Amino acid sequence: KLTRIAIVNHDKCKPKKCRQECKKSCPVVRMGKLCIEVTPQSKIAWISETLCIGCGICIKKCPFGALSIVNLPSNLEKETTHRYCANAFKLHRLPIPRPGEVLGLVGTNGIGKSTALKILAGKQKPNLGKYDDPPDWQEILTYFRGSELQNYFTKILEDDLKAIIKPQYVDQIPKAAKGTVGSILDRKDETKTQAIVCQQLDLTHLKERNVEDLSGGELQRFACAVVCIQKADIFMFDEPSSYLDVKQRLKAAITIRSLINPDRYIIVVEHDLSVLDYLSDFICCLYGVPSAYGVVTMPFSVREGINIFLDGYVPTENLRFRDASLVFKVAETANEEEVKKMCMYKYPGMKKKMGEFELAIVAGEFTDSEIMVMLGENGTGKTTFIRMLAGRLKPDEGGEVPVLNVSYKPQKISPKSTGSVRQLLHEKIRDAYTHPQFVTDVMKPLQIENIIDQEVQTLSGGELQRVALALCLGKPADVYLIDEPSAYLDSEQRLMAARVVKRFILHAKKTAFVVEHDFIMATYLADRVIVFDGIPSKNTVANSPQTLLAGMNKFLSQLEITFRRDPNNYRPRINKLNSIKDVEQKKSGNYFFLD
Amino acid sequence: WVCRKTYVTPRRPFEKSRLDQELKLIGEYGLRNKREVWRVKFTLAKIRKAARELLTLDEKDPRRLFEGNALLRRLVRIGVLDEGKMKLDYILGLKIEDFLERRLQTQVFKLGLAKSIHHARVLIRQRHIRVRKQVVNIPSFIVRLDSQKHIDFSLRSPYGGGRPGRVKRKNAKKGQGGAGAG
């Protein structure tokens, strides 16, 4: 049914004035195995996790109310809204789609969030244990009788609530559908709202341009636009804020916020920093084990829910384990040996062009055994430049050829290699620096073994991103080209993986061109920063490379947007466009505090 | 709301003498359980208690007159007592078996059309009888005296006028799809 365990530290939990009744009257510490370990001492009482059967006897006759009782998460065939079959993922609860507010849905990766949306949409209908010899619009309505979802599902039947979703992935599509320029979006539908959507989407650029010439930005934009302009009753946004600019993301959240108020239901996902404050008004957290079981907790207020999700484990109200610092790198460390020797290369100030783009580079120092960070706004000319330097098109005048072999990290990842991932891992090698490495990205807590086997076709975003992360330190090459690793990863998985990537390429002597849109992702991974400046579909200047601080200040001076440090935990928190203090930071120009 | 029991259990759990009487009584009338017996004996012992009061009350007390007069009418109206008696002393001469004569299944068998008593209970339940104009399904009708000359079969049944059953009309369709087209 569930799990139970004891917890011990408290304000004057005093093992030096209680005689220690917890050790004296615990059944486990009597049959031989020391569950509770304590003495008359200066520290705290120690209590194990694994050996505690549950009971609560120690709690009822500890002389100080220091020891409380937690209950750890476990499956016990309870609710069970659906399963695929056996030895496979299952979900228990899909809960209230409260109207007039937007419902924010916030859990680790591979937990069933997307699956809950599929069920809510009426498309993949729920199976509820079994196997699923009951459907049909009767038995499930009888099962969730006495509640609410009877009224919801009967209104769906009858298609009184019309379904729309923004899909999780880009790739299969710009591949599965096709799009007539202008005409397409045009004979989409209808008026004033599309003009509001495309204009408040802050694009003004792709009105006269074919889809195939566009990138992430354009794609997402058009997508959201059409989705909204789509005359319907319900509305779902899965993952709407991936691989988009920081300024542009805020103006996406408020265009979503337009649809909410007058008896309409709305479900959003997301893996946020502190922008979820403007996305949603109810936050609903999901827990469990990645790719095994997922449980949805009942919804909370956004402020209250946010911290309790990143706090490290908030229950009351249940309970769990893990969860804590991750909104950064707090990986206090630095320094090396003597670094000898090195070089000074240097790449020249090339001028590049395509058709509707004037793209310019400035000369800079690309140091041996050292990171380089690219940004800067969407459309600011970063990716196609790197391909043009390596070999694809260019140059008209001059260039520098790579001294070292080359590792290509791609951003447009939707690969097609039929058979298995294990077959593709043989085009790399699993003997080299054989001591952990892929195993040091992930193995013990989230599992890999988890990265082999299975098909790449059915693999989810962050795991698919990890396939690409492996494909880079896996052919023999030492100069690394990486665009957007923060794509489809959260905070828990991204920050540790990013620190591991930096440790590899710095320690055995390499250089990597990282193209992050993540404060935590960009910062802890930065040095030079190089800054890209200029307006989309016009002009791109890579600013002559300067200081992490000075380059980040150039990016945020033009945009007009800033961050605050969470003072207890060292965590970033975005500002609300225009505030009070949002004026001291603008003047002090300082957008980072506490180096 | 308001509920109460209609029977009581015996004080002794077992007693060779008692069990034979309860068994052989159930055999005669086709009763399902002892709960159908003790039910009768609760009502009777209740009536035997009320009577036992009024005999000790003063003769020509107004309470004693009005109760007895309207009581004995009810005992005569169901026909467990005669009006050639008509006094309270004969209440105590009343006993268990006289009631059971006025049960529906007993009156079907005794004064109507049945085989053995075990048959007659089935006819009551399978809706082949009526009481004056009204179908019944309860063999515990206990039947008022006036209504004994209106016990008849039902007016929609294969017993008397009305549509046949599904054993006959089945076999009729065996002449048309069992040997007429099959």
Binding site: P99, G100, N151, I260, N261, P262, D263, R264 | -
Partner: protein, 61 residues
């Protein structure tokens, strides 16, 4: 046997005035809307938290 209860009005308008609504709509000439239940209360509490202008919430959510 079956037993019911019947009215007979002298004119239409005497029925149409007096008559509980569902009995008139029983053989149609009236309906209901209105619209289910709930959408009323959640709007009411939102209207409560504005002053002067509540025309957004009445149409607008």
């Amino acid at each position: 046997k079956t037993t019911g209860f019947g009215m007979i009005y002298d004119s239409l308008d005497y029925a149409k005035k007096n008559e509980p609504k569902h009995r008139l709509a029983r053989h149609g000439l009236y309906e209901k809307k209105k619209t289910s239940r709930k959408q009323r209360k959640e709007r009411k509490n939102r209207m409560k938290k504005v002053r002067g202008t509540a025309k957004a919430n009445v149409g607008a959510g």
